[PDB]
Symmetry: C4
Subunit: 70 residues, 4 copies
Amino acid sequence: NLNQIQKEVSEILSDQKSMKADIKAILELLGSQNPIKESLETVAAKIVNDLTKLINDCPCNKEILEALGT
Amino acid sequence: ANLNQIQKEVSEILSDQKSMKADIKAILELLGSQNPIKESLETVAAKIVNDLTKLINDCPCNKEILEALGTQP
Amino acid sequence: ANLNQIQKEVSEILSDQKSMKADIKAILELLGSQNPIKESLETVAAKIVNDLTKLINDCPCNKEILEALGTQPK
Amino acid sequence: NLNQIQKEVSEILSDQKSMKADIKAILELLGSQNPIKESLETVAAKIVNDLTKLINDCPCNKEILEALGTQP
């Protein structure tokens, strides 16, 4: 009865330690992550950037200029 | 009254605790097993540029113009 | 009040317990309802390249070149 | 022995208090952000729109225009 209470109160207490441990880990992990918007905005910048280079590199001009004669 | 009441409540605390523990464990498991968004975003970007590169390097619109200049690609 | 003290405190643990349980569920609910980022990345990847392919294949610039060359586009 | 129970109940109560706060944080942190769907969608929208602005701007035409606006 009182031993029963004691036992169960301990189990609660140790269970409560591990719960706390993991909660911290969760708060840590989430805090570490970079903002979705930020990751997006930068990867989105890299997509346009690269493709812009390719576009401005004008790959399809050589063929035309040959038919014309430049 | 009191200790019997106390003991009953303690037992409900113990079990409630047990499931919360399990649920927390799962949230940790779920977040932890997810590959970083930055890493994911990058591989998919790699596909996007790569595939639009194949297209632009295929010069789709040249074909129309070379035709007007009586020649073929 | 020893039993009283123990009583009042165990009761409070039990209250807090309930609302912690609620909030842990709301967290699980939130993460659970997320699409797998990989999958929803694929969808969006396709639409970007799709929409773009449409425009480039439509060949917007050709009309300018043709008219400069001296030809009517069809 | 009743004291140990009393003592331990309070350590239980106080940890409870601080876990309550941390979960509330985790909820707030997870709440403080739009779905990954919405985010992707607006970004993708900007991606295409800027590349559409680029292409419709016809960067390569100026080169050929001088090649056409020229003589042997």
